[PDB]
Design an enzyme around this catalytic site. Structure first.
Site, PDB file in Angstrom:
ATOM      1  N   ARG A 174       0.847  -1.192   0.000  1.00  0.00           N
ATOM      2  CA  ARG A 174       0.000   0.000   0.000  1.00  0.00           C
ATOM      3  C   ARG A 174       0.888   1.250   0.000  1.00  0.00           C
ATOM      4  O   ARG A 174       0.428   2.340  -0.328  1.00  0.00           O
ATOM      5  CB  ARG A 174      -0.911   0.020   1.233  1.00  0.00           C
ATOM      6  CG  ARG A 174      -0.134   0.057   2.547  1.00  0.00           C
ATOM      7  CD  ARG A 174      -1.021   0.170   3.778  1.00  0.00           C
ATOM      8  NE  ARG A 174      -0.199   0.014   4.971  1.00  0.00           N
ATOM      9  CZ  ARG A 174       0.164  -1.157   5.485  1.00  0.00           C
ATOM     10  NH1 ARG A 174      -0.237  -2.292   4.927  1.00  0.00           N
ATOM     11  NH2 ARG A 174       0.964  -1.196   6.535  1.00  0.00           N
ATOM     12  N   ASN A 175       2.163   1.080   0.348  1.00  0.00           N
ATOM     13  CA  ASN A 175       3.106   2.204   0.395  1.00  0.00           C
ATOM     14  C   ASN A 175       4.143   2.245  -0.728  1.00  0.00           C
ATOM     15  O   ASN A 175       5.191   2.895  -0.624  1.00  0.00           O
ATOM     16  CB  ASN A 175       3.784   2.254   1.767  1.00  0.00           C
ATOM     17  CG  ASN A 175       2.847   2.770   2.852  1.00  0.00           C
ATOM     18  OD1 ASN A 175       2.017   3.657   2.596  1.00  0.00           O
ATOM     19  ND2 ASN A 175       2.979   2.231   4.076  1.00  0.00           N
TER      20      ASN A 175
END
Ligand SMILES: CC1CCN(c2ccc(CO)cc2NC(=O)c2ccc(C#N)o2)CC1
Length: 289
Positions: free
Chosen positions: A156-157
């Site tokens: 997600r990063n």
């Protein structure tokens, strides 16, 4: 949590050119937001030595933010200005610190996060997955060389920009941590399923800790975006498992050699984990496709 420069590793840690006119910024839609900050897409006119009009990302604080919040934003600004540029980092391009709220201008990644990309691609080839893996390892090797710890390595990063090239950055101030169940309440909201045991039990955060997280990211990439430890809730049983040496099974699309990297990253003893530079080389040699 947030990026941070620590003392000695690998190298050696010894320690307003970025100012841009805010009126030369045209704000667009909000990309994401957290409890005390948010990031928005915007167009900047005449930015850099090339006087580009490129699209960019602008991080800023929210009304619910105070001194402490403002300092964290300035600290991130300072870290990014010190690290220097790298192809696999969401690079700093400018800032607006006068004449209004502090604004941090960084490169914009048009394709968004890798996790969502993998979930809508379940076309992707094995080669693409290996490239994602190498690009992030390159970015992490860069941070490691500057004694900079990431602390939230996860799909997600990882953002994808032009050419689907992966980049990493500090997205904490715009991360919706309060409403994301992946961040577990601890006294603090921590992404427990991505954290190394020492970080969980001893609250120790080092480059080796990020390596463990990088192994979890690899599992996310080669499972095409499954949530780690599928079906397993975060609680005493979970903590006992990880502390006891439990490791996730090989992902459906991971070649044995890639799974071997995950296992290495998950060595309980931090010094038994490979370095990001070693990971890059192994991936460079391909090891497996
Ligand atoms: C915490 C999340 C990080 C990723 N996020 C984006 C979503 C979608 C797209 C494509 O429309 C782009 C996103 N973000 C960036 O390009 C970018 C540069 C710097 C930051 C920061 N913080 O986010 C929303 C917030």
């Amino acid at each position: 949590v947030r990026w941070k420069i620590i003392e000695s590793y690998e190298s050696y840690t010894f320690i307003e050119k970025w100012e841009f006119p805010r009126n030369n910024l045209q704000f667009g839609k909000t990309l994401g937001a957290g409890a005390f900050g948010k990031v928005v897409e915007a167009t900047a006119f005449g930015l850099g030595k090339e006087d580009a009009v490129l699209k960019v990302a602008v991080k800023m604080l929210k009304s619910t933010a105070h001194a402490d919040e403002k300092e964290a934003l300035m600290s991130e600004l300072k870290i990014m200005s010190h690290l220097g540029q790298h192809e696999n980092i969401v690079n700093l391009l400018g800032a607006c610190t006068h004449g209004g709220p502090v604004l941090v201008i960084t490169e914009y990644c048009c394709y968004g996060d890798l996790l969502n990309f993998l979930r809508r691609k379940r076309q992707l080839s094995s080669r693409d997955l290996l490239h994602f893996s190498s690009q992030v390892a390159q970015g992490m090797a860069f941070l490691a060389s500057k004694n900079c710890i990431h602390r939230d390595v996860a799909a997600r990063n990882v953002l994808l920009t032009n050419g689907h090239v992966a980049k990493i950055g500090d997205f904490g101030l715009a991360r919706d941590i309060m409403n994301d169940s992946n961040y577990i309440v601890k006294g603090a909201r921590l992404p427990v399923k991505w954290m190394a045991p020492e970080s969980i039990f001893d609250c120790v955060y080092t480059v080796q800790s990020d390596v463990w997280s990088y192994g979890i990211l690899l599992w996310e990439i080669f499972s095409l975006g499954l949530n780690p430890y599928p079906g397993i809730l975060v609680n005493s049983k979970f903590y006992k498992l990880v502390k006891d040496g439990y490791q996730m099974a090989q992902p459906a699309f991971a070649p044995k050699n890639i799974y071997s990297i995950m296992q290495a990253c998950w060595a309980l003893e931090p010094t038994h984990r490979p370095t990001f530079q070693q990971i890059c080389s192994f991936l460079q040699e391909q090891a497996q496709e």
